[PDB]
Amino acid sequence: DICPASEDESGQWKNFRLPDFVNPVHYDLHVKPLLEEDTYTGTVSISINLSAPTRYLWLHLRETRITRLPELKRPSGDQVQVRRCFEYKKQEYVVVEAEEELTPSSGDGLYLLTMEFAGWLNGSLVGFYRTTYTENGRVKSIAATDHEPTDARKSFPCFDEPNKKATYTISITHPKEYGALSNMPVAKEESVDDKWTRTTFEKSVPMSTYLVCFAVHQFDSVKRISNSGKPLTIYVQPEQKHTAEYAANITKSVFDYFEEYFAMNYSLPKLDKIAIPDFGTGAMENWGLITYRETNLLYDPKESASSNQQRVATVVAHELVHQWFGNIVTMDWWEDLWLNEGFASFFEFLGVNHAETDWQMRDQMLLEDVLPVQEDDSLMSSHPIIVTVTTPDEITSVFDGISYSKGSSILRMLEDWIKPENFQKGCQMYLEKYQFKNAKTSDFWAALEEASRLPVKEVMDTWTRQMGYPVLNVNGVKNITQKRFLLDPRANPSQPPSDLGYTWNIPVKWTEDNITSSVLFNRSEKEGITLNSGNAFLKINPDHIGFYRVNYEVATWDSIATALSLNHKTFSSADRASLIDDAFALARAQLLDYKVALNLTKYLKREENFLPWQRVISAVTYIISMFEDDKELYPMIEEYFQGQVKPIADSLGWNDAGDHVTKLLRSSVLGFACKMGDREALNNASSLFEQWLNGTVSLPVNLRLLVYRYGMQNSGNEISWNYTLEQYQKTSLAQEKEKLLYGLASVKNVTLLSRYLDLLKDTNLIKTQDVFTVIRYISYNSYGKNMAWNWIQLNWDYLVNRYTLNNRNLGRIVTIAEPFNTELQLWQMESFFAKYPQAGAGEKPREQVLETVKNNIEWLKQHRNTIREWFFNLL
């Protein structure tokens, strides 16, 4: 109404990107929430460095409206006359037009633009919003922001681009019962009424809009002091105060470690962490005020699993890395997002490894990031690490496996190639150089090239400017050639077009005889290279350190199987996992006969290590799901793999004994036993479940999930379903809540699963943050695979309206269709996608799940008989 929408394209505001010549220096931001009303108002003053003649000034704004006609100042101080304001929806701009036009800011003086705005706190988990929780029977409120990537513009009008760094002084007018937090410490608190307080924070260092954060809360706090002498506090509900302790410990330890590792001081005087009762992502690295989902921050040693403990530790560490990589140095544009996320996903393992020494964290990188993303990046519908993005939906989409996991994986290879010491120093120099500014990928290579003198740009560009990765083909034990690895054998290996033509500069490592050698495999060695006393066995890619797969000659693979059966310890735990992972991926890709891959599983009755079991289970889970409906194959696969885990499942038992990694092993090994239908394992689950239903017995923390799942699956009924639902409401610990939701999703009852799906529309029962988690759990249920799939179709309009097409999690929900493997199911998917063709942030996931389902159909056609023969002949 005041700044009406206009379809006027005839200006520079038609461009997706902000202009080069308008730059913010300082933001004066004031917001006043009306918490009980779900509204807020605010005014913002922005100091602007103008570089070119313009009759129009524009910046980002979404949903939140301008309420007063904005006022502009010249660097001299004079009021500039304003003809009109208008909104341009297509690119999310509010544009104001001066009568006349004005000239560049020449000296130390700047233009000043102030605008008045009003927005909503309800119906959303982005921008500035309010949510509730219960304390001593009273409903309490908390308000916070969440901006990454393009949501700062919902909170307040701003230049919402990562490279438009400005300095911030924030103030909030709030009721006095509430405290206020932001990026910086409190500077002054002044009484407005005897009811309202105005909290003003001290000036920030230069930072990006997406990092700007404020909150209004009535939380308690657990406190720690760094070696720097700076306060590190975690804000937490009084009820949950005891569960903030562990996160407090890790923050201390990892904060102290990183400041020392990066040779650079944390740029702010304090650091705060807070978990919002309803929060849309895992966690957010808002400088000095890191926000969390409760499951990623709050941990109870008496109730939470080792899995949960590691998750809290890892996310906290991840969030800390960002204080350096992301906050101090930011990417210039979202195309270089991996400079934030890859680095965070890499250093997270070093952080936690320092804090928890016997967790074998560096090895766990293989399970968490490397091997899972080698599945992703073997699809045609992957994308290069450096990604072209032209809409907010494309921007948000690239917060994915590639940015995080592949980013992490190629740094891991890079570090090993370049040696840790030099990698460390190179990172420090980069951090020194671009501090409080923005960097491109090219800048990071040059920094490490200064630190090692190795050809970093030349080599790392191949891993970064094209999607995918190579398989090394072994000829004659010693000759290797490279070829792009694709899961679909029919796919065109040259597509989509790449300047580098899908050949890589591969840093290659191998183990001769406990002795390690290194070679860079050059791109232009078109006919391959030869690996430098006379040998009978070459172990290529030790600990799967390089982002590629190795395909040995079939005779070699045969010998590996035999060697595993004789003495499996001949290979390290990591090497076993890697060989198993490669073989099964190769078999999946029709590059190795399945009988050869399956032969590697024969030794398993003697396997006792975490890493090989995890990758075995990953590979079997896929094969088993492809044959779910096959009454001939399934029992045979079940019978075999049941026999292979039985010894380790029996050996570890149903009890929380041993170190961290052992406890993780027990979880997944007992789970697989249950999955494979081991009567004794299932009876343990039922027995414990029955006891838990008696309402006193606290289950062993690392067995709970399994007990809820397989207990409910095997002996669940309405009475125990209702009980479980009550328990979920009653527990304060989010980590327990999440397990109970999985339990509820496990019942073998269409009526009860139907009730559960209906609860998704009930915001008093299922939090907005948990809807997609629940749908995904239900999709795992043998009945619910189809129910969840059908429910998202029937309720698509509802979900879009509730979340918007810009919601990443909504975009991704179609991946519940991944297990599909028939032409009928593919037709359903295509029909539904054609009916709702506006995919938003779901565009990539749609492409990916379609490719996956097409692959599944082909896979069945190619491999059913082969796999059938192997099992039939064996049993």
Ligand X SMILES: *[C@@H]1O[C@H](CO)[C@@H](O)[C@H](O)[C@H]1NC(C)=O
Ligand Y SMILES: *[C@@H]1O[C@H](CO)[C@@H](O[C@@H]2O[C@H](CO)[C@@H](O)[C@H](O)[C@H]2NC(C)=O)[C@H](O)[C@H]1NC(C)=O
Ligand Z SMILES: *[C@@H]1O[C@H](CO)[C@@H](O[C@@H]2O[C@H](CO)[C@@H](O[C@@H]3O[C@H](CO)[C@@H](O)[C@H](O)[C@H]3NC(C)=O)[C@H](O)[C@H]2NC(C)=O)[C@H](O)[C@H]1NC(C)=O
Ligand U SMILES: N[C@@H](CC(=O)O)C(=O)O
Which of these ranges, 106-114, 456-464, 476-484, 769-777, lies near ligand X under the rule CB under 6 A? 476-484
Which of these ranges, 177-185, 388-396, 471-479, 750-758, lies near ligand X under the rule CB under 6 A? 471-479
Least distance (Å) between residue 344 CB and Zn ion: 4
Q: Is 495 in the site for ligand Z (CB under 6 A)?
A: no
Q: Is 873 in the site for ligand Z (CB under 6 A)?
A: yes
Among 114, 228, 498, 590, binds ligand X (CB under 6 A): 228
| Binding-site string for ligand U from residue 120 to residue 159, where x marks contact by CB under 6 A and - marks none | ----------------------------x-----------
Residue closest to Ca ion (Cβ): 148
568 is in an annotated binding site: no
Q: Which residues pair with 290 in a beta bridge?
A: 273
Least distance (Å) between residue 309 CB and ligand Y: 8
Q: Which amino acid is at 388?
A: T
Q: Is 864 in the site for ligand Z (CB under 6 A)?
A: no
Measured CA to CA, the distance from residue 28 to residue 534 in angstroms comes to 72
| Binding-site string for ligand Z from residue 563 to residue 602, where x marks contact by CB under 6 A and - marks none | --------------------------------x---x--x
Helix pair angle (734-744, 718-730), 10° resolution = 160
Residue closest to ligand U (Cβ): 281
68 is in an annotated binding site: no
DSSP state of 492: -
Name the residue among 170, 172, 169 with its Cα closest to residue 197: 172
Q: Which amino acid is at 678?
A: D
Measured CA to CA, the distance from residue 10 to residue 20 in angstroms comes to 18
CA angle, corner 235, sides to 330 and 404, nearest 5? 35
- Strand order of the β-sheet with 289-292 is 220-225, 231-236, 271-275, 289-292, 283-284
| CB nearer Ca ion, residue 146 or residue 738 | 146
Count of positions on this chain that bind ligand U (CB under 6 A): 6
Contact positions with ligand X (CB under 6 A) in 493-532:
530
Least distance (Å) between residue 301 CB and ligand Y: 6
Measured CA to CA, the distance from residue 660 to residue 658 in angstroms comes to 7
**Cβ neighbours for 776, distance < 8 A, ≥ 6 positions apart:** 788, 813, 816
User: What is the Cα Rg of the chain in Å?
Assistant: 28
322 is in an annotated binding site: yes
| CB nearer Ca ion, residue 146 or residue 161 | 146
Contact positions with ligand U (CB under 6 A) in 279-298:
281-284
367 binds, among Ca ion, ligand Y, ligand U, none (CB under 5 to 8 A by kind): none
Tell whether omega for the bond before 149 is within 30 degrees of 0, i.e. cis. Answer: yes
Name the residue among 327, 353, 355, 351 with its Cα closest to residue 341: 327
Joined together, the tokens standing for residue 398 give: 């690239």
Q: DSSP states of 672-700 as a string?
A: HHHHTT-HHHHHHHHHHHHHHHTS-----
344 binds, among ligand Z, Ca ion, Zn ion, none (CB under 5 to 8 A by kind): Zn ion
Measured CA to CA, the distance from residue 632 to residue 710 in angstroms comes to 24
Binding site for ligand Y (CB under 6 A): 38, 120, 122-124, 245-246, 249, 301, 718-719, 722, 749, 751-752, 755
Helix (H) or strand (E) holding 479: strand 479-484
Q: Is 476 in the site for ligand X (CB under 6 A)?
A: yes
Helix (H) or strand (E) holding 272: strand 271-275
Q: Contact, 559 vs 566, CB < 8 A?
A: no
Q: Is 265 in the site for ligand X (CB under 6 A)?
A: yes
858 is in an annotated binding site: no
Please identify which of the residues 319, 368, 449, 736 carries the catalytic annotation. Answer: 319
Q: Is 680 in the site for ligand Z (CB under 6 A)?
A: yes
| CB nearer ligand U, residue 146 or residue 582 | 146
Binding site for Ca ion (CB under 5 A): 146, 148
| CB nearer ligand X, residue 555 or residue 875 | 555
Which of these ranges, 16-24, 218-226, 344-352, 365-373, lies near Zn ion under the rule CB under 5 A? 344-352
| CB nearer ligand U, residue 115 or residue 331 | 331
Query: Is 319 a known active-site residue?
Result: yes
Q: Contact, 50 vs 21, CB < 8 A?
A: yes
CA distances from 702 to 656, 660, 698 (A): 6, 10, 12
Joined together, the tokens standing for residue 772 give: 């997609």
242 is in an annotated binding site: no
Q: Which residues pair with 141 in a beta bridge?
A: 132
Count of positions on this chain that bind ligand X (CB under 6 A): 7
249 binds, among ligand Y, Ca ion, ligand X, none (CB under 5 to 8 A by kind): ligand Y
Name the residue among 873, 732, 798 with its Cα closest to residue 244: 732
Least distance (Å) between residue 153 CB and ligand Y: 14
Q: Is 317 in the site for Zn ion (CB under 5 A)?
A: no
Q: Contact, 25 vs 49, CB < 8 A?
A: yes
Which of these ranges, 23-31, 317-325, 364-372, 676-684, lies near ligand Z under the rule CB under 6 A? 676-684
Q: How many CB atoms lie within 10 A of CB 420?
A: 10
Measured CA to CA, the distance from residue 328 to residue 319 in angstroms comes to 13
**Cβ neighbours for 569, distance < 8 A, ≥ 6 positions apart:** none
Name the residue among 167, 118, 298, 201 with its Cα closest to residue 733: 298
Least distance (Å) between residue 830 CB and Zn ion: 34
Joined together, the tokens standing for residue 660 give: 């961290």
Least distance (Å) between residue 853 CB and Zn ion: 30
Which of these ranges, 238-246, 323-331, 447-455, 682-690, lies near ligand Z under the rule CB under 6 A? 682-690
Q: Is 283 in the site for Zn ion (CB under 5 A)?
A: no
Q: Is 50 in the site for Zn ion (CB under 5 A)?
A: no
Q: Contact, 769 vs 280, CB < 8 A?
A: yes
| CB nearer ligand X, residue 265 or residue 831 | 265
Helix (H) or strand (E) holding 112: strand 111-120
Name the residue among 837, 839, 834 with its Cα closest to residue 811: 839
Rule CB under 6 A: which residues touch ligand U? 148, 281-284, 399
List residues near ligand X by CB under 6 A.
228, 265, 475-476, 478-479, 530
**Binding positions for Zn ion, rule: CB under 5 A:** 341, 344
Q: Which residues are annotated as a binding site for substrate?
A: 148, 282-286, 808
Site of interaction with ligand Z (CB under 6 A): 558, 561-562, 595, 599, 602, 650, 680, 683-684, 687, 870, 873-874
Q: Which residues make up each annotated binding site for Zn(2+)? A: 318, 322, 341
Annotated binding site: 148, 282-286, 318, 322, 341, 808
Just list the catalytic residues. Answer: 319
